[PDB]
Amino acid sequence: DFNVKKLAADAGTFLSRAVQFTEEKLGQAEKLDAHLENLLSKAECTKIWTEKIMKQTEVLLQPNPNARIEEFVYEKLDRKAPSRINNPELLGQYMIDAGTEFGPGTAYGNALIKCGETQKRIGTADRELIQTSALNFLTPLRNFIEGDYKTIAKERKLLQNKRLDLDAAKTRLKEFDRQAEITRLLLEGISSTHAHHLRCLNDFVEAQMTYYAQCYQYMLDLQKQLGSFPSNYLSNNNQTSVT
Amino acid sequence: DFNVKKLAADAGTFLSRAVQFTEEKLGQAEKLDAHLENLLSKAECTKIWTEKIMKQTEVLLQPNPNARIEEFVYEKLDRKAPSRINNPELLGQYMIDAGTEFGPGTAYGNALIKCGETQKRIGTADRELIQTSALNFLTPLRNFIEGDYKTIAKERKLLQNKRLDLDAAKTRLKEFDRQAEITRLLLEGISSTHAHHLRCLNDFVEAQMTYYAQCYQYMLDLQKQLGSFPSNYLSNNNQTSVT
Secondary structure, three states: OOHHHHHHHOHHHHHHOOOOOOOOOOOOOOOOOHHHHHHHHHHHHHHHHHOOOOOOOOOOOOOOOHHHHHHHOOOOOOOOOOOOOOHHHHHHHHHHHHHHHHOOOOOOOOOHHHHHHHHHHHHHHHHHHHHHOOOOOOHHHHHHHOOHHHHHHHHHHHHHHHHHHHHHHHHOOOOOHHHHHHHHHHHHHHHOOOOOOHHHHHHHHHHHHHHHHHHHHHHOHHHHHOOOOOOOOOOOOOOOOOO | OOHHHHHOOOHHHHHHOOOOOOOOOOOOOOOOOHHHHHHHHHHHHHHHHHOOOOOOOOOOOOOOOHHHHHHHOOOOOOOOOOOOOOHHHHHHHHHHHHHHHHOOOOOOOOOHHHHHHHHHHHHHHHHHHHHHOOOOOOHHHHHHHOOHHHHHHHHHHHHHHHHHHHHHHHHOOOOOHHHHHHHHHHHHHHHOOOOOOHHHHHHHHHHHHHHHHHHHHHHOHHHHHOOOOOOOOOOOOOOOOOO
């Protein structure tokens, strides 16, 4: 009865320390009073959070910092680059050829090109889905990464550089005021004036959302375009079908 | 003016013969009169069409016979194998940790876990999407591949085997009737009695379709759960926001 005791005694420490082992892709700022160290740590969480949503919409598997390495490389122009081909275009690309190869004297000939044009028009919607996820969700946050975030990192880097310079200036008894003011104004801008990312998430969920209803209400029309075999080919003299 | 003539003269043959170069993964049956050779060729198109829809729903890129090689390997049991993790589970898996790491004294604390639980409940819907595409669309057609299609290929193989045997029996002048009857009944079963795949496509489009409306009408609720900042935090004394 002592093994299952000692088995839970050194496993509680392993279960308690299972958090601080991963989820790191950048450095850490210099350890300032709690009014400024809390703003600097909140800036570090704001940096890791603003640079950890854009890894999520392009690939479909993002549980790891490999998607953050995929996010750290960035692209501004879309020139000489087409859309990525999706599942519904390839779900109808063969079926067009299968419908013109199978046979026209059969009720599948009024049926396979209906599903083929259905999949080929969900193909343009999924071509739109990769564009509305990359133009209003990937683009302005990336331009804010290479915009004022370099200015914020520059002002806090010169803050942490010249803080030790004024430590050298004040500790010998007998560039930090203006730099700390611009840095603290940037930190209070990215904490208090945070009306930049509520709209980004609230428009990203609408940009994902307004494709699902369109392709659903277009796939509802396939039962109307395909409803002739429970009404006209149901009464066929060759075979009966499902009503 | 003769170069652009000859350039469009040898290129018409290349544009006319751009079809018969690919799209082949099995063999061809033996070349029988047109009432039986047309049924045998229709059986070959029925075989390539029935064995070329199941390659399309699992992977998202199927323009080539590599998806047909992925389709030729088949799996019956789902034992000791979980669901594949999708995009919305991984779209909220970090955001739960980001919400409990960022800060609770801010209106994002009433906002990030809302989007996180939204993405985590689209995660179960995309966990359902890989199951309704693999259980009612991949499973019974695969059981029909290793079911009566082996019987159809066996009866037509013995047809093409003993047809030359009765050619040997009849051409020397001075097992094919019953085999040809069972084979022709199987070919007329897979041509005329074709009420097996209208329901499969008509239920595959409903199985894809009834996820889109559910996740759309669940993402419409995020504007209601997130509508408190255009009504209560809009009148906040720190900052105004968007209405």
